[model samples]
Target chain A: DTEVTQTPKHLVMGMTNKKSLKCEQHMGHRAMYWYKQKAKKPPELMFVYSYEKLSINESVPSRFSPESPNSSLLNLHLHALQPEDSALYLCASSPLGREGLNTEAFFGQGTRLTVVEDLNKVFPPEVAVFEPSEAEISHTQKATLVCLATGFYPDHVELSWWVNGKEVHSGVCTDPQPLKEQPALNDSRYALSSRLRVSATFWQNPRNHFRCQVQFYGLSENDEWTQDRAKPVTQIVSAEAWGRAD
Target chain B: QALSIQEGENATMNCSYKTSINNLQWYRQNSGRGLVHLILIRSNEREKHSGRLRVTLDTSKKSSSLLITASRAADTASYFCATAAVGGFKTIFGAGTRLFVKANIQNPDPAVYQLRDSKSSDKSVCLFTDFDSQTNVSQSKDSDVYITDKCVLDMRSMDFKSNSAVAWSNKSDFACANAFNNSIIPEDTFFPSP
Candidate 1:
């Protein structure tokens, strides 16, 4: 019963085409929001309408007009959108409340909007494997293997570690979010790091081996860099340990 | 500052504060950096359990503990404890504990999100949200303040214009509780008596 419904699950339109996105919920929520989410990135806030009124607008372009005909109905009239504007448009609704209360928001599946052409392209990442520094090993008595993935477009990538051909799950630390490279411009890419920590005794054993795996998710199934055809990049952890810390 | 544990081991974190609290909560920042709310314990509670996590509170010592059983390496992240006081002061957060699992781990419980609607059908609320910073300065206390209607002013995203008449008209001493980092309600803010 508590659901937000978005219409036209998918839409394709030209820059000159005029269309409207619709969102509806009868849960009697008084607060509604519009968010635009890009591949591998968090949703970006676009507009908020409270109590059937345009309360907050993030300086959205005039081409995107928002309307609240009633408490249960909301719409976004789109026009003259740029090719790069193609993204998943999300709609969410929540009960009205003052600050300090944790008001839960219900979200719709979102509308996949395509503006004329696919302007967003996918780029594979460069991977490198490293071992812990002298100071690190001395401090924790653990062998930490670092996997760095950088220069990747769209942040949707996952990292995993393997030991002796078996997937290893313990002692891994990966950044919760991707970081945009500094001096990032319109074509700026993302980077993140993952670390695998193992007991010094276990790592010192010559029989032990490690490899880091990076999986990239592309924008479409047919994407040349998608998982089907493109094999995941696996980098074997460096064989040498730090001075064989006893 | 940091706790180091091995794989297949348990991790414990503790927090302490001075104020009287209505409830206490724990949160975790995944390796991806987004904070996921973990658990909440009310003031009347002494111990609570969720999956492999156990939380204990001792009001007498003003301390709380969070224990993670069968930890994994992925559990190596920053954990924080927050407390909400009884008098509506804002929640306070600790410096946080940085846990390092040499090898450990499990998925903590996900946060529960839900709506809270009033029981009465006839009564209504006036919620002024997402306004520009100056919206609070434009209104006058004597002429614009509504008494008959139920008004809930979102102190956040909105503020009073230097103790304006409207601020005092609500009989709220903490018009903007941000000074103390609390969400302060006015001493006489609207709450229909039971």
Candidate 2:
């Protein structure tokens, strides 16, 4: 028997909320572990409990508690977490046969977590547009426009590019994954960017307007997902002036 | 940062960490898809090679590099490096490398990614899902499928046993298409291990 099960596939809690993350296994494995993974980063080791005893703590904060009632169960009690503490918590187990022997581990689907400072406040993404750099214009005959969306909570965001009021799917590339910003930046919100490329002649046309539309999933205090849009005002670039300068 | 390369060019990614590891593994994920294991190299082994893929590890420097040769547009994906602990079961991953391979359009069949040239194993049987569009493929039920190699076998299926094992492959050549090739597969069922 080799199965590890985690509870509550997703979790959303306030800073003051006290909760417990549960992990269970019936494999009779003697070791169990917990890991925390942030977006775009690898999982960080948090706690390792072996043979129903605490083996390693990895210098984790005291707000997080690791408990192993028996060889088959493990739990993490959380309290007073900051918004930056939001991450995907993973659980794994292995048979501790020897010190240096290599053994395969069984992993469970991680629990996606979101810790909010203000449970009722829904933060929408802020959008910005950037034109191609001068060096890129000098080296190539194409223009690339970058649309950046950042500083958002609960990272379910969709970004789209429009050319002259019509959405163009071709010649467009968007980030398939959203990145969690550093704790020092934007209070640990999420960020992602999209790019659109067009020929210099096409970009130089004054009639062509490029716009970025952002759709964000906002969570309400009542545990409902509400729709929030952060669309930038339609601003046209000075194509003629850009051409003349080029 | 993102790495952009023209089609048919090579792409290399590097990962570094501070602690000792028992093994390091590379995984690739297509856009919004599940991660597929690419290669795994142990701490004792410095270098390993697979089809179109080469991995080198420098334990003294605590760094590893992944090299992909003759990349195709479909190779555009995110690559991550995961390190398993030496004395414990904890595994931690590093920041991923996002690569975009720009290329011209082509037939680009998905039947095979890497080729494993070896003699057929007498202990293994080659089987594939054999069904037509007229069949109810979405439902979970017992059914038999034939293979082109002209082989036969009988097996029983049931609900998930609440017990399973996840295996990783480190062989020179493997294919991701064979397991998930749009074939009708019964869900939440267990069959004899291949």
**Candidate 2 docking class:** incorrect
lDDT of 2 by residue, A125-160 (tens): 766655543333443454555555665666656677
Can you tell me which runs of candidate 2 are displaced by over 4 Å? A1-4, A24-30, A58-61, A94-100, A103-107, A123-153, A156-246, B6-9, B19-21, B27-38, B50-52, B69-78, B89-95, B102-194
Output the worst ten-in-a-row residue range by lDDT, candidate 1 chain B.
Answer: B107-116
Best candidate, TM-score = 2
lDDT of each: 0.55, 0.58
Question: After best superposition, candidate 2 residue A110: deviation in angstroms?
Answer: 2.5
Clash pairs, candidate 2, are: A42-B93
lDDT tens per residue, model 2, B56-168: 99999999999999997678888888787765555667888889776542221111111111122111111122121121222111112111210111111211011001111
- Per-model TM-score on C-alpha atoms: 0.35, 0.48
Model 1: residues with Cα > 4 Å off, grouped in runs: A1-103, A106-121, A132-140, A164-169, A176-184, A222-246, B1-194
The 10 consecutive residues of candidate 1 chain A with the worst lDDT sum are A234-243
Q: Write the residue-wise lDDT of candidate 1 on B145-184 in tens digits.
A: 2211111111121221111111111233322222111223
